[PDB]
């Protein structure tokens, strides 16, 4: 019997974008022989990690480091009296101090010491989640949210040394907001806010700790009880000029305090407030404080929940005495930012927990302390200042922004073939389509006469050292010639009466045009004139099949018998022909040779029978043979510059594309790399780009596939344009890099520019003063009938309000005849929304208000007046909030809190057609989905999925299966009839399947007999009904099929029958914290056997390195060396529940980056194929499976 056992291949296509941690240190010295500068930053999101530099005033990707496979719960850089390397704490409790190093040709992250603490999980006892380092780098401190605090004393030597941990344990005191005070080397002092866990009243009390380097323990110093309203602590550096006595800034909600260590000085300064105070107004708070000091002037920046950015300076109050004062003022503010840094340069990096991280340079620096108007003082602690925010943005100037989606709420999958993902932007509220396809610009296109075929571009020999370049087009009957100059595109002898098989430049200032019947040898004469010095027939008068060429070299193949070899004479311009017969023994199909060099060995010949031969250019010999499928449609030979590999790119008829490694000396055919793209005979062309210079081959089909090879990797890709008939690299004085001249399949010339390429790190491009939209997006919708038309729905933060913005095709739509591209709905807020078509010709929209009211709308497309017109129809009161609804046949299928109502279409309001009462277990329905209108899968907050079946004439959904365990399901879909996808609030990605015992029953029986009537259940099921009525109430159970843990929270699953024409249908998910990843079902077995073995290798690979490094120490690198963190793979990915059949490819991908020594060291554990074939199978997934 065939084992179902779905084998899913997880990939992270785009890596988690919500940046939770940062560090200011200078890690690597790159591109400079000797340089030391403190300006650089490394930022971490849980697993994912990135390293940015500025140094230009504009932020720069340095390298995206390998996936750590853990949850980084804090990261802080340490600077010791040297290269500054960051201390990193995560799950496993391990304190892992890592240095970013340059190894081989890339930057890899090396670990120095990892210290075991607590256990492996995210815990309250776990001394993580609160971490800071002595600003002089003498000691690192970790703490726990509740139980205990540990502080290591860090020392540097020939090898780094971490001192034994210093423990303090307070059982009932829940710790929050660790903030360490800088010191002069006196003694390290850290400050916390301890809230008592077990108490009758809520008591939040600050506590000071001075670690004593002399006595080597942490000492409780001052315990100050403050109001329960307390928020956070910041460290005031010295106050050495005013009057060891550290001073802290305690942010409360509606006011700020600062407190002395000795309690002598407690200063209350009330935080100012906005003028509008829109709708709901909290007492607010300050989320993030930071400190800066220069030229005796130290000011701190503290930002409120509204994003208001404030400063404090200290004044002596010379009149009274020398004593500290506290002075608030107002700045440019910003959006809410989790953490703030400042370079030694005037650049202030704002890391926003909301969406985007952006960097500043401050000039105005803010208002002077002299003004009493807008500045508040500690003179009178009771006072209030109202201020209107300033969008003019005087103080701070945005230099660089980083496009990221931290809160991606929903998305729809648009343009299934190029995997394009349509999702909102949270703050800016712009439409973001992030795409797998290559980003392709289009500029100054021009309409060509109909029925065009191929294209070429050759430098104009007539004008030497000039921008003029000749562009050649082809029609079957006619040939068109065109002249290129900057901004000047003009039209022009040669042969216009016959199709052009080939044309190329020879040597210097010469051209040859090969056409079906005869050749032409053309040379430039004067400016607009050219002259043929010689003309050729084929054998003596046939139809030339094909032609290829090199720089100085040429080949043409006539009908059948012989092939013709040409060269150009050196020191002059001439053509010669050899006397010889290369009979080729068959009819030559197409010819290929390297045109990159003046002399190209190893011609590549194709045969109509479907075989490919090599020709040694002693002289000619056939060293290899390929029998491949259908006849070759087109083929190109290209040797890359970097590695010098000569690759033969062989396109085939019916749309199969192929690629071959070609040995230079032997000419053997090895390393077959195939693909299937579209249905059409493919076309190929060669282009050269950068992103170091680079070369790719464009492939023309139903789609357009750029095949490019990055370093030791290559990825075929679809391009953003729908289709391209013929493509060749182009250059213009108008700035052109990656620039290309091509033609659409419509027979229209166009110029374009490719920009971003889907590398392993990116795999996407994101198509989108300070800009913040008041409307925060809600959901995203798409019409069933229109294949892709995407409707967006947002909300207002304030008085309840909504907007609806519909887009189809390129950009949005107008609303009616109005200028506005969106619609505003007053007093309507959307808890959940879905669009429905009750009739095939009518389209309605569905809103569920927080007022518990169901609102119906009508969508209109104006069509060449084209605009969206929304129309309010009915009003219906609802009992529940309606968290989930969807399209059932002809009807709205909605879920109340308890029960599932199926509404029909009534007039003046919509009607309840049927109601289904849930089993007692289900409290609420988060999300639900249908299978072909027959079946449903209904999710819960607390409990798990339960599948229903619609019974006609019973007018009810009957639950036929329960779920095994309790799982909190955010989003849920169907792969099939019998299986279900689901995610968790906590980050589990699982897939369940109904048991075959149930599938036989439902396949062999009608649903009407389930609720009442005769259905014969095996003896065990009934005994489970009377024995365990609570679990088996639904009389079946989901056997766990696939389970996985992705640390994000999955927002949207989508099951795509094909990803960029790939055969294996994938399921792609976007997470909330932002991510998109896929689960690819693996066909056959040895796919998942080889993948499983590679994952098993990379799993303990760090341990294998540790045991080798151990044995060599027995005959004469820590344990977490290769993983950089203590977490095992199976442990991290297992976590909540063990992964079942899912093998994680995100691990096996890390095998690609390791050096050849390490890789060959790992693969020796297998009797199976060599490292090269390993990398083959690894890279096979992105190419072939999507």
């Amino acid at each position: 019997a065939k084992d179902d056992e779905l084998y899913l291949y997880h990939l992270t296509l785009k890596k988690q974008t919500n940046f939770v941690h940062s560090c200011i240190g200078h890690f690597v010295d790159l591109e400079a022989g000797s340089k030391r500068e403190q300006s650089q930053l490394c930022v971490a999101t849980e697993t994912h990690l990135e390293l940015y530099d500025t140094a230009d005033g504009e932020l720069k990707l340095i390298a995206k480091f390998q996936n750590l496979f853990a949850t980084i719960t804090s990261m802080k850089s340490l600077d010791l009296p040297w290269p500054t390397f960051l201390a990193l704490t995560s799950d496993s409790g391990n304190l892992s101090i890592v240095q970013i190093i340059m190894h081989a040709g890339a930057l890899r992250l090396k670990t120095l010491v990892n210290q075991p603490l607590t256990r492996t999980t995210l815990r309250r006892v776990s001394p993580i989640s609160y971490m800071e380092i002595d600003p002089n780098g003498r000691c690192i401190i970790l703490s726990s949210v509740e139980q205990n605090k540990l502080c290591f004393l860090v020392d540097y030597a020939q090898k780094l040394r971490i001192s034994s941990p210093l423990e303090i344990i307070r059982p009932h005191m829940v710790t929050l907001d660790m903030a360490v005070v800088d010191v002069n080397f006196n003694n390290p002092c850290f400050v916390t806010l301890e809230i008592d866990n077990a108490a009758t009243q809520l008591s939040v009390h600050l506590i000071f700790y001075v670690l004593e380097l002399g006595l080597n323990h942490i000492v409780k110093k001052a315990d100050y009880l403050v109001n329960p309203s307390a928020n956070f602590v910041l460290s005031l550096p010295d106050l050495s000029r005013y009057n060891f006595n550290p001073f802290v800034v305690i942010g409360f909600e509606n006011h700020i305090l600062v407190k002395d260590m000795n309690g002598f000085f407690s200063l209350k300064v009330e935080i100012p407030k906005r003028s509008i105070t829109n709708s709901r107004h909290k007492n607010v708070t300050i989320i993030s404080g930071i400190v800066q000091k220069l030229k005796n002037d130290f000011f701190v920046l503290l930002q409120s929940n509204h994003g208001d950015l404030f400063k404090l300076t200290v004044s002596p109050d010379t009149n009274d005495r020398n004593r500290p004062l506290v002075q608030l003022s107002y700045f440019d503010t910003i959006q809410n930012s989790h953490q703030l840094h400042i370079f030694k340069n005037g650049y202030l990096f704002a890391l926003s927990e909301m969406n985007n991280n952006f960097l500043f340079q401050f000039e105005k620096l803010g208002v002077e302390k002299n003004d009493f108007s807008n500045v508040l003082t500690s003179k009178d602690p009771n006072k209030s200042l109202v201020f209107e925010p300033s969008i003019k943005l005087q103080n701070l100037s945005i230099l660089s922004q980083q496009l990221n989606l931290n809160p991606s709420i929903k998305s729809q999958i648009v343009s299934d073939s190029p995997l394009s993902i349509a999702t909102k932007h949270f703050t800016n509220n712009k439409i973001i389509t992030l795409t797998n396809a290559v980003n392709y610009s289009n500029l100054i296109s021009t309409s060509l006469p109909p029925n065009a075929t191929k294209l070429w571009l050759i430098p104009d020999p007539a004008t030497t050292g000039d921008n003029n370049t000749l562009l050649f087009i082809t029609f079957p009957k006619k040939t068109m010639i065109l002249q290129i100059d900057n901004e000047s595109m003009e039209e022009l002898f040669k042969l216009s009466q016959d199709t052009t098989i080939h044309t190329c430049l020879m040597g210097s200032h010469s051209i040859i045009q090969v056409c079906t019947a005869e050749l032409r040898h053309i040379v430039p004469t004067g400016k607009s004139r050219y002259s043929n010095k010689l003309t050729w027939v084929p054998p003596a008068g046939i139809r030339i099949v094909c032609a290829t060429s090199s720089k100085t070299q040429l080949i043409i193949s006539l009908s059948n018998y012989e092939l013709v070899y040409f060269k150009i004479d050196v020191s002059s311009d001439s053509l010669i022909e050899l006397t010889t017969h290369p009979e080729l023994d068959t009819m030559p199909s197409k010819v290929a040779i390297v045109q990159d060099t003046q002399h190209a060995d190893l011609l590549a010949i194709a045969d109509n029978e479907g075989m490919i031969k090599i020709m040694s250019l002693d002289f000619l010999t056939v060293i290899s043979l390929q029998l491949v499928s259908e006849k070759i449609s087109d083929m190109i030979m290209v040797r890359d510059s970097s590695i010098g590999q000569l690759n033969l790119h062989v396109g085939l008829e019916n749309g199969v594309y192929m690629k071959f490694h070609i040995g230079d000396v032997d000419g053997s055919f090895t390393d077959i790399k195939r693909r299937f793209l579209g249905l059409k005979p493919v076309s190929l062309s060669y282009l050269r780009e950068i992103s170091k210079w680079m070369s790719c081959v464009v492939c023309h089909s139903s789609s357009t596939w750029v095949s490019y090879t990055w370093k030791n990797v290559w990825t075929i890709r679809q391009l953003k344009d729908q289709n391209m008939l013929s493509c060749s690299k182009f250059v213009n004085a108008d700035v052109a890099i990656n620039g290309v001249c091509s033609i659409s399949s419509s027979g229209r010339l166009n110029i374009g520019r490719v920009s971003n390429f889907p590398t392993l790190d990116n795999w996407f491009h994101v198509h989108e003063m300070l800009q913040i939209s008041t409307f925060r997006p809600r959901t995203i919708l798409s019409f069933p009938n229109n294949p892709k038309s995407i409707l967006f729905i947002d909300n207002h933060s304030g008085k309840k309000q909504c907007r609806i913005s519909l887009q189809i095709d390129g950009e949005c739509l107008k609303f009616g005849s109005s200028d506005h591209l969106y619609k505003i709905l007053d007093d309507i807020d959307c808890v959940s929304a879905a669009i429905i078509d009750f009739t095939r010709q009518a389209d309605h929209l569905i809103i569920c208000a927080g007022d518990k009211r169901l609102l119906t709308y009508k969508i209109l497309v104006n069509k060449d007046k084209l605009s969206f017109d929304i129309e309010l129809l009915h009003q219906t009161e609802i009992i529940s909030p309606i968290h989930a609804m969807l399209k059932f046949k002809n009807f709205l299928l909605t879920a109340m809190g308890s029960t599932i109502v199926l509404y029909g279409l009534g007039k003046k309001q919509l009607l309840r057609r049927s109601v289904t009462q849930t089993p007692v277990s289900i409290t609420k329905i988060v999300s639900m989905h249908q299978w072909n209108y027959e079946r449903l899968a209904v999710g819960d907050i607390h409990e798990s999925v339960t599948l229903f079946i619609w019974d006609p004439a019973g007018n009810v959904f009957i639950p036929y299966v329960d779920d095994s365990v309790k799982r909190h399901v955010t989003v849920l879909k169907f792969l099939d009839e019998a299986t279900v996808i689901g995610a968790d609030r906590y980050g589990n990605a699982w897939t369940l399947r109904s048991p075959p015992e149930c599938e036989k029953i439902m396949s062999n029986h009608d649903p009407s007999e389930l609720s009442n009537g005769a259905i014969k259940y095996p003896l065990d099921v009934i005994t489970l009904q009377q024995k365990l009525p609570n679990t088996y109430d639904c009389k079946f159970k989901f056997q766990l099929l696939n389970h996985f843990f992705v640390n994000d929270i999955i927002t949207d699953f989508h099951i795509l029958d094909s990803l960029s024409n790939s055969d294996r249908p994938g399921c792609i998910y976007m997470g909330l914290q932002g991510t998109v990843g896929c689960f690819i079902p693996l066909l056959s077995k040895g796919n998942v056997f080889m993948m499983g073995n590679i994952e098993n290798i990379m799993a303990e690979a760090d341990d294998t390195f540790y045991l080798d490094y151990e044995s060599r120490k027995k005959n004469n690198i820590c344990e977490g060396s290769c993983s950089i963190l203590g977490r095992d793979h199976q442990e991290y990915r297992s976590y909540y529940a063990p992964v079942r059949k899912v093998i994680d490819g995100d691990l096996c991908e890390n095998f690609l980056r390791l050096s050849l020594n390490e890789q060959e060291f790992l693969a020796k554990n297998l009797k199976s194929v060599q490292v090269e074939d390993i990398i083959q199978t690894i890279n096979e997934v992105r190419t072939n499976y999507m």
């Binding site: 029909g904 009534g906 007039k907 003046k908 309001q909 919509l910 009607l911 309840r912 057609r913 049927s914 109601v915």
Partner: peptide, 27 residues
Amino acid sequence: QELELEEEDEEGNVMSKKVYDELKKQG
């Protein structure tokens, strides 16, 4: 130990299934 069958005056969106069947027998 609430279904709505939509009468023709468009006020029957509150009207029960069995009630509208009774008005089928009456109609």
